């Protein structure tokens, strides 16, 4: 699996609606391209994928 260091999160827009209504952007630094498993550790927000 690729390594990810220096990870920062920014939020572009938010709207507490029933559908998926917020956009999150991750800035990072990696050595090679691949796949990661995103997750949220609290039930306040639910990811889409």
């Amino acid at each position: 699996a690729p390594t990810i260091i220096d990870l920062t999160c920014t939020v572009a827009t938010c709207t507490h609606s029933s559908d998926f209504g917020g956009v999150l952007t991750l800035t990072y630094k990696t050595d090679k391209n691949g796949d990661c498993s995103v997750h949220s550790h609290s039930n306040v927000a639910t990811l889409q994928e």
Partner: protein
Amino acid sequence: KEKGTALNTKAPFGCQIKTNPVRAMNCAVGNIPVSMNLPDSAFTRIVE
């Protein structure tokens, strides 16, 4: 002979008088309120 003046050359706000039917065209004053109603096909989803 002695009618004196007119309105075409005296109207305020620079708006042209015409005739048949009488009207004052392009006559700048005031504000126009607009009330709209839009369908959901006009917007775009956030995702794209």
